[PDB]
Design a protein around this ligand. Structure first.
Ligand SMILES: [Zn+2]
Lengths: 670, 195, 766, 210
């Protein structure tokens, strides 16, 4: 459910590695494992909000999850187990009926035919399962699943046909692209391409189309008025991709030569994202003084009448300075409001991407301003994002208006949250602004963790609030408060469930959470003499399990906020852990320090609950391992652990030639 | 448990989870009666007067909600008209003996602050709108429960002051003052003024 | 320049193992008390939750408040006075520690706020509207109104009068801000409110105040490519409750992100600091990579009307580990910059920047060019400049706590008159305020001491006759503490302290006599007594006592009996002085001071009257004869000494008749012994330039109560307070709560007479 | 009748031992006269019409970085005022005889200005100021006050005496400067001292004759 909610566009190999990890940590039978995959997928589909998220969830269950199962089959008698899991699932009639009411069709039929196509299931199994499902079921628009399952081959074939610009026929390109701009067709293609790993090539194709249509050639009005529309369609769909599926699918990741495209630089330096706030007087927003006067004269001329040669990248880069001079003119008073209306109509009318570039600079500039100084510039957005200017539209105007209104919603939303301002473009932002306005943020955390424990699984909305709290209060505060809420449980059942949930919650940034957990929380609980009454057997065994699962999963080795924040972070782990493979990698340093602490606790006097804790930690280090986290164990632990009470030697030693000597010493002298 | 026993006892009580799971009416927290004034109380709805918990047979590991004070049931019954004898049969009140039952007192206070909240929502779109009906029923119910000393006046007033402190609940304070006027006008001559 | 005054280390309690370090707090008060936390980490984590109070003159004695802070202490903050300490940790919980029984060794917090779960990231007391500016170009101007002048600042939240409320404002790691207002009663009002509607991370924050009573709080989320946002907060009290009104201000981005050559380095803003609280228009930021850093100064200045423009920035540094901003409120304008560059006055123009190597840079405020460099020969994890900014304290990446002295001209050699004028200017600033002057005595060389004392007396004169009233005991304390520092002048300090004690007795005895009826009105009976004793020069005590309306000098014979020990000190000091006359000793100054001998005469006369009322109040003298009137004998010799000095322009050397009569005094009476107050354990006399003292904490490299003159035993059973400056000892609780002269005991509840604080001394248990 | 009562007390070591006696003999009866009958726990603050009490406590210059005056907000409860009079701790003092009467009087003036902006339902009321001091004034002009800075005690007590504020002095030790200040605060156009030593001159208010 986490991989469905946060990164649909992630590669399947990382997910297969993580799932095989989880299957090895807690020893999970294969039918129950695949059953939990299907149950999670269907529950997340039912709980999805209506709109793009529902399309994305249908793609994840229908396309990505069947591919993941195929990779598991190669890595691992899988057909018998997946057939068993399908019978396990087909007992659950209320889940499947809720799903069928949301799917508007029987979605289990499409699942069984899809798993038949991938080869997870034999055909006789498929047919008797569909017979059972029809018997249990007995008691004009195509649904989205058929659209997606047929739209993935259109993704491949649209790649292969628009490699060549429809044999350089821009009228054909425009018609097919307008059909894509029609309702929901773009979203269907993007959801299929995201779930099937082909969003990067799709973005490369539209970016290359954009580079081709940037300059243009000697042309009369009719050919150019097609070329500017191609620029608009490619630009608006690229902005919609970058706002929905993240910006890192737009990046080229290696550009040999300086010829980075226009849209990549514009998105890099000029488009607001979630964690990106922009400098309005960055040198990117001040290209020249020469072209910008030509452009303000161009906007004050009339209907451009000169779209026959515009070099649209230069125009779009220059609009920021242009509207800056317009704003200074209006702040002095030398321009009337009625001429402002004329300039905004000349911007937003013929080409809609100009409005997006202007609104991006306006959002940066309004974010920097004070409270009382804002009032004029917001009116500019009200005219740039207003309803349609009419009677000179090129073609496909209403659909570009719809996509543009979505992009401007997601650009302006933060600034229009700072001051209570309604622009009212007409849900498209279903998980946005989730925290209560005044409540301290630990109450939010404890309430959501209480509800996740009492349900037994993590919702999609709960995943989004947990992400915002991890970004807001930081890793240490988050991990410490969740572990406190663990340690005040008193039942065996609730402690084991809380740990099995907290591992997945910590999979937001597993690596940093393990550094905080094994470096700050556990040494503070083991070293403080007042604290270790909290380390009693009911919560203590569960906590030791969570620490060893975190250590193993971090050793063997994910969201965009977490990528940005770890790139922000500076710390000296050599100075933090002085320590009396690389050993400049911080996780090796934390593990070596923790095992020194464990040996020191086992060797000392005053046995209490903390000694029981380090016993349990070493025992699940032994049991959870296949064979290595225990490569960092000091060899004095081999002697001491059976002083404090076989296999806990023979696994922990890692079997070097000197390691046999310590092994044979301990095992013979038990 | 003690740190030396530990798992040895805890897991043992966990193996008595299915037996407790057999002996639990499922959804018992969300089942509500229809309040009839007839008497002859079914003993399913009786609560514990000390702690508002359901009385449970045995010492098993019951489900986590059955150890919580059942305030939803008591608020639903107190919000109904003519639920006077049913609340006494629930909390074991007897009216031959005055007791100052505390959890009843706290539930009545929270009922008052809930009425104050719901009066402060609008109360002006619909003239009846269930608000003034609620305040009339609150007058009658709270008169009976403070009059026979099952709850007490000044602890109720100062706890009510602590709930309304800083919450900023001011649109229907006249109704709350009216209800307090019913108590004072009912029983000023019986008690000292320091109450 | 920089000299390490001392290095105080823990003994064997270092080597924190297996648990990583935490950031430290440090706070230097107006009185010289350091409050700081350290990472001790031995057998408990509460050893990282203890707040150490270190009086800067006796560092070995470190008090350790066991704060009940469940997470790590983020911020420490002294009052505008020095009397309370705010401490806030992660997960809310601001506690306000106050002194217990006015001891600087016992702290206890009764008042606090709590925003649970949210880590406090900035904390400040509210501003009380007092702000003064120092005009260095008027250093010679011979009036304190010209040198230090109040600058018309308004306090946030004035309540019914001119009186500011006291309270704090804290900023959490969420968007929340909270204000707590302490009433004059014990009540406390709290309110929390988000800073703006877009709730977001506040990883660094800072608080300044403005004229107009507006708080200005700056927030950053550490990313260094995101804006440093600014909010104006206005506090009000609506009828019972605090009310917070916030408003966005112009944010700023940061240079080195628009550098465009290599902009990706320095990705973390690590310190955000206004240049001083109440200086809300300038902001110091510090971006840092793993190895290098940049500090920058910005200013709000208007032209978009208001707009943050950069002032200056350093080139490239090491990674800045700590930052200390000055506290001396210089006047900062252009003429004062000129005269402080000409006459090399540099105390208020420096910030200190520690680095991740050993070095420390004292750098200019306005254009951040390095003024001095001190190489440690391990890094400073917390620094704090002093209130006169002559010394900076600092806690290292070990247990070590060091105090460095910064010279006022930053190592450039000055002629002696300029150094005299600088240190005299600072001592006058500490005299007008009540701040402590210990850091100044770090910089006073011995060879200048006497000249400096002369200048103080010349500046004690030529003020406007009310300043001379209010600066009396402050200048006696400063004179004594200066004269401690030189071997030529070390003899006089005892005199100064007895001078304080003499005045402290004299006025109080003249305070006790309530005239039962007003005869010869418009003169209080202190003045009638002084007039009568100065016009009647009779050598007999009876002839003076006759003419003094002795039905006026009446007490209730209970307090009159309880005054016995103070009257005993008066008689014994007179006898010691007169026997000391034939001989540099503890009494040498008093033999030629006519005024003090007049005071001793007046006290002997009122002692005679009180002895006739009740004979038990009198001092006792072991006389080597039984037909003797010892009081009349000492009064005869005192009048004959005092008539020497009460002449106009006299300096009469004492004649031989007095010399032989005072040679006969050990024959007639036994001269007892006396305790002299400054039992000197101060470091400033012990220190030398170029040599740092290496101390251990708690190692510390005829017992009387000096204020109520009670003899404790050999090893005293009752516990005691010691003054931190002079060193006088008093027992902690009064011996007889019924018979206690509260007019005398209640003067020294909060301080000593010299001015320093009390500090509880531990019992011996031999 | 409606009264704006302001007490100005010297919180120093002198007035330390004598305060308890002064309160029983003079201060407590004066409060009762304004509030008929002694107060006990039923009196509620917040009636902006009515008698309103206030404290101003001042100090000498030995509380060197601390503030000089501690003022309390107005209360309509006489009982809260009595608890405030108990709550004073007399800890100050040192080697001096004088105190900062100018500061206490200037903040009393600011209290009476805020009272005058408060009560507009009545134009003028009984505006009573008491000074419970044991010490002659300093020669400092007032420093820690706005709108009355740079004023000596004589100028401030002239401004108290004009505009119709009834100024009273209760002192446990008979003094010349206090008598001169009382004579100066003469409103535009009886032995109350129970103990002979006490000097009590009351321009306004009625205290049982002793
Ligand atoms: Zn002293």
């Amino acid at each position: 459910l986490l991989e469905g909610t946060m990164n649909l566009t992630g590669e399947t190999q990382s997910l297969v590695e993580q799932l095989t990890m989880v299957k090895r940590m807690q020893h999970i039978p294969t039918p129950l494992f695949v059953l939990e995959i299907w149950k999670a997928c269907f529950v997340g589909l039912i709980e999805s909000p209506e709109g793009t998220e529902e399309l994305k969830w249908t793609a994840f269950t229908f396309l990505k999850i069947p591919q993941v199962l195929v990779k598991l089959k190669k890595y691992s008698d899988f057909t018998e187990d997946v057939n068993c899991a399908f019978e396990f699932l087909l007992k659950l009639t209320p889940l499947l009926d809720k799903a069928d009411q949301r799917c508007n069709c029987d979605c289990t039929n499409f699942l069984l035919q899809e798993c038949g196509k991938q080869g997870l299931l034999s055909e006789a199994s498929v047919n008797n399962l569909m017979a059972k499902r029809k018997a249990d079921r007995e008691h004009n628009i195509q649904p989205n699943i058929q659209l997606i399952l047929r739209a993935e081959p259109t993704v491949t074939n649209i790649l292969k046909t628009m490699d060549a610009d429809h044999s350089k026929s821009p009228e054909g390109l425009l018609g097919v692209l307008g059909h894509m701009l029609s309702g929901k067709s773009l979203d269907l293609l993007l959801a299929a391409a995201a779930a099937t790993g082909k969003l990067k090539s799709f973005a490369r194709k539209f970016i290359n189309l954009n580079e081709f249509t940037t300059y243009g050639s000697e042309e009369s009005t009719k050919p150019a008025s097609v070329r500017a529309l191609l620029f608009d369609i490619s630009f608006l769909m690229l902005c919609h991709v970058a706002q929905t599926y993240g910006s890192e699918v737009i990046l080229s990741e290696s550009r040999t030569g300086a010829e980075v495209p226009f849209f990549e630089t514009w998105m890099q330096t000029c488009m607001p994202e979630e964690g990106k706030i922009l400098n309005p007087d960055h040198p990117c927003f001040r290209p020249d003084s020469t072209k910008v006067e030509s452009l303000v004269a161009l906007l004050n001329n009339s209907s451009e009448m000169k779209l026959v040669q515009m070099k649209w990248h230069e125009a779009c880069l220059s609009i920021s300075a242009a509207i800056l001079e317009i704003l200074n003119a209006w702040e002095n008073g030398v321009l009337a409001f009625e001429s402002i209306q004329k300039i905004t109509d000349n911007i937003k009318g013929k080409v809609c991407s100009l409005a997006v570039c202007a609104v991006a600079w306006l959002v940066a500039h309004v974010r920097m301003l004070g409270l009382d100084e804002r009032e004029k510039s917001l009116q500019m957005i009200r005219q740039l994002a207003g309803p349609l200017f009419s009677e000179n539209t090129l073609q496909f105007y209403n659909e570009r208006v719809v996509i543009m209104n979505s992009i401007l919603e997601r650009m302006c939303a933060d600034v229009l949250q700072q001051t209570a301002t309604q622009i009212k473009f007409p849900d498209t932002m279903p998980y946005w602004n989730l925290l209560p306005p005044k409540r301290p943020i630990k109450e939010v955390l404890t309430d959501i963790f209480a509800k996740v424990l009492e349900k037994g699984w993590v919702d999609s909305r709960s995943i989004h609030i947990f992400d915002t709290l991890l970004h807001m209060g930081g890793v240490y505060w988050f991990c410490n408060n969740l572990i406190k809420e663990l340690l005040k449980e008193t039942r065996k059942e609730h402690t084991l469930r809380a740990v099995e949930l907290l591992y997945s919650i910590f999979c937001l940034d597993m690596q940093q959470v393990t550094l905080v957990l094994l470096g700050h929380i556990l040494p503070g609980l083991l070293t403080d003499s007042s604290k270790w009454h909290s380390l009693m057997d009911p919560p203590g065994t569960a906590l030791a399990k969570l620490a060893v699962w975190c250590a193993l999963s971090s050793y063997s080795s994910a969201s965009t906020r977490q990528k940005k924040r770890h790139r922000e972070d500076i710390e000296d782990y050599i100075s933090l852990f002085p320590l009396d493979v690389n050993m400049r990698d911080p996780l090796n340093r934390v593990l070596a320090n923790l095992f020194l602490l464990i040996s020191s606790i086992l060797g000392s006097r005053t046995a209490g609950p903390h000694t029981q804790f380090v016993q349990w930690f070493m025992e699940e280090c032994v049991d959870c391992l296949e064979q290595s986290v225990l490569q960092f164990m000091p060899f004095t632990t081999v002697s001491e652990l059976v002083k404090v009470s076989k296999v806990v030697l023979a696994i922990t030693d890692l079997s070097l030639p000197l390691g046999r000597q310590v092994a044979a010493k301990a095992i013979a002298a038990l | 448990p003690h740190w030396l026993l530990g798992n040895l006892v805890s897991d043992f009580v966990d193996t008595f989870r299915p037996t407790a799971r057999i002996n639990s009416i499922c959804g018992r927290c969300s089942l509500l009666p229809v309040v009839n004034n007839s008497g002859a109380i079914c003993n399913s709805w009786k609560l514990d007067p000390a702690t508002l918990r359901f009385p449970l047979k045995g010492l098993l590991p019951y489900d986590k909600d059955l150890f919580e004070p059942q305030t939803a049931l008591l608020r639903y019954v107190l919000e109904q008209p003519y639920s006077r004898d049913m609340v006494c049969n629930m909390l074991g009140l007897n009216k031959q003996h005055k007791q100052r039952c505390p959890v009843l007192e706290d539930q009545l206070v929270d009922l008052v602050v809930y009425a104050m909240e719901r009066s402060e929502t609008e109360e002006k779109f619909d003239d009846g709108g269930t608000s003034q009906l609620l305040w009339q029923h609150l007058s009658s119910q709270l008169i009976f429960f403070v009059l026979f000393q099952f709850a007490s006046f000044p602890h109720m007033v100062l706890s009510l002051h602590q709930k309304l402190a800083g919450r900023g609940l001011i649109k229907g304070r006249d109704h709350l003052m009216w209800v307090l006027l019913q108590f004072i006008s009912g029983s000023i001559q019986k008690n000292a003024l320091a109450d | 320049m920089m000299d390490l005054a001392y290095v105080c280390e823990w003994e064997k309690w270092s080597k924190s193992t297996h648990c990583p370090s935490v950031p430290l707090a440090c706070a230097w008060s107006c009185r010289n008390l350091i409050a700081f936390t350290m990472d001790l980490r031995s057998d408990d984590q509460d050893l990282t939750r203890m707040i150490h109070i270190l009086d800067t003159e006796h560092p070995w004695d470190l008090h350790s408040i066991p704060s009940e802070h469940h997470e790590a202490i983020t911020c420490l903050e002294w009052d505008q006075s020095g009397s309370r300490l705010l401490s806030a940790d992660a997960d809310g919980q601001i506690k306000c520690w106050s002194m217990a029984d006015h001891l600087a060794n016992s702290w206890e917090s009764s008042v606090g706020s709590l925003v649970e779960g949210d880590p406090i990231v900035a904390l400040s007391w509210l501003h009380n509207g007092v702000k003064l500016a120092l005009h260095v170009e008027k250093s010679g101007a011979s009036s304190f109104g010209e040198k230090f002048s109040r600058v018309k600042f308004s306090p946030s939240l004035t309540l019914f009068g001119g009186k500011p409320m006291e309270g704090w404002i804290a900023v959490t790691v969420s968007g929340l801000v909270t204000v707590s207002l302490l009433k004059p009663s014990g009540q406390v009002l709290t309110s929390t409110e988000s800073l703006c509607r877009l709730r977001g991370r506040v990883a660094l924050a800072d608080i300044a105040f403005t004229g107009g009573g507006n708080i200005v709080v700056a927030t950053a989320d550490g990313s260094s490519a995101s804006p440093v946002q600014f909010y104006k907060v206005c506090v009000s009290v609506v009828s019972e409750k605090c009310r917070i009104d916030t408003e966005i201000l112009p944010s700023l981005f940061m240079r080195c992100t628009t550098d465009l050559n290599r902009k990706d380095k320095f990705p973390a803003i690590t310190h955000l600091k206004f240049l001083a609280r109440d200086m809300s228009e300038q902001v110091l930021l510090c971006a840092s990579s793993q190895t290098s850093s940049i500090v920058e100064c910005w200013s709000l200045r208007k032209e978009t009307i208001l707009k943050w423009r950069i002032l200056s920035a350093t080139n490239d540094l090491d990674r800045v580990s700590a930052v200390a901003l000055p506290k001396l409120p210089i006047s900062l304008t252009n003429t004062d910059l000129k005269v402080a560059s000409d006459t090399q006055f540099y105390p208020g123009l420096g910030l200190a920047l520690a680095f991740h190597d050993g070095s420390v840079h004292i750098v200019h405020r306005l254009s951040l060019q390095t003024m001095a460099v001190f190489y440690s020969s391990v890094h400073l994890k917390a620094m704090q400049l002093s209130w006169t900014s002559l010394a900076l304290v600092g806690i290292d990446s070990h247990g070590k706590l060091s105090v460095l002295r910064l010279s006022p001209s930053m190592g450039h050699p000055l002629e002696v008159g300029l150094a005299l004028r600088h240190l005299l200017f600072l001592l006058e600033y500490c005299m007008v305020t009540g701040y402590d002057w210990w850091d100044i005595l770090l910089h006073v060389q011995p060879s200048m001491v006497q000249s400096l004392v002369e200048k103080l007396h010349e500046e004690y004169t030529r003020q406007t006759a009310a300043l001379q009233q209010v600066l009396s005991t402050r200048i006696l304390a400063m004179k004594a503490s200066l004269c401690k520092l030189s071997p030529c002048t070390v003899t006089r300090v005892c005199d100064y302290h007895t001078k304080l004690f003499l005045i402290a007795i004299s006025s109080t005895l003249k305070s006790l006599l309530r005239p039962h009826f007003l005869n010869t009105p418009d003169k209080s009976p202190g003045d009638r007594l002084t007039e009568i004793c100065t016009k009647i020069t009779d050598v007999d005590i009876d002839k003076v006592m006759i003419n003094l309306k002795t039905e006026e000098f009446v007490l209730d014979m209970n307090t009159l009996q309880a005054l016995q020990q103070l009257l005993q000190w008066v008689g014994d000091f007179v006898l010691y002085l007169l026997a000391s006359l034939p001989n540099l000793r503890p009494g040498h100054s008093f033999l030629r001071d006519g005024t003090s001998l007049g005071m001793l005469r007046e006290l002997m006369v009122v002692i005679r009257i009180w002895g006739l009322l009740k004979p038990s109040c009198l001092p006792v003298y072991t006389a080597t004869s039984d037909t003797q009137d010892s009081m009349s004998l000492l009064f005869r010799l005192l009048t004959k000494l005092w008539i020497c000095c009460r002449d106009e322009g006299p300096a009469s050397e004492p004649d031989e008749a007095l010399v032989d009569e005072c040679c006969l005094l050990p024959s007639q009476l036994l001269i007892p012994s006396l305790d002299w107050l400054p039992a000197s354990d101060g470091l400033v006399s012990r220190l030398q330039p170029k040599q740092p003292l290496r101390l251990q904490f708690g190692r510390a490299p005829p017992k009387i109560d000096h204020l109520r003159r009670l003899h404790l035993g050999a090893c005293p059973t009752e516990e005691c307070k010691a003054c931190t400056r002079c060193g006088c000892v008093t027992m902690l609780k009064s011996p007889n709560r019924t018979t206690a002269v509260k007019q005398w005991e209640q003067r020294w509840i909060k301080n000593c007479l010299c001015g320093g604080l009390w500090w509880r001394v531990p019992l011996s248990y031999p | 009748v409606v009264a704006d009562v302001v007490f100005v007390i010297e919180g120093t070591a002198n007035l330390g031992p004598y305060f308890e006696g002064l309160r029983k003999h003079y201060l407590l009866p004066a409060i009762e006269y304004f509030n008929g009958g002694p107060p006990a726990e039923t009196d509620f603050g917040g009636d902006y019409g009515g008698t309103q009490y206030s404290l101003v406590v001042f100090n000498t210059v030995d509380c060197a970085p601390e503030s000089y005056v501690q003022c309390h907000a107005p209360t309509s409860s006489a009982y809260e005022f009595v608890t405030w009079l108990d709550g004073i701790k007399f800890m100050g003092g040192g080697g001096e005889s004088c105190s900062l009467i100018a500061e206490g009087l200037s903040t009393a003036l600011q209290l009476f200005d805020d009272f005058k902006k408060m009560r507009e339902q009545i134009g003028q009321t009984h505006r009573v100021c008491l000074l419970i001091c044991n010490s002659p004034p300093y020669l400092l002009p007032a420093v820690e006050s706005t709108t009355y800075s740079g004023c000596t005690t004589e100028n401030l007590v002239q401004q108290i005496g004009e505009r119709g504020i009834h100024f009273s002095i209760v002192s446990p030790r008979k003094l010349p400067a206090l008598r001169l200040l009382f004579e100066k605060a003469a409103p535009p156009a009886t032995d109350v001292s129970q103990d002979p030593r006490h000097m009590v001159l009351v321009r306004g208010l009625v205290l049982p004759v002793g």
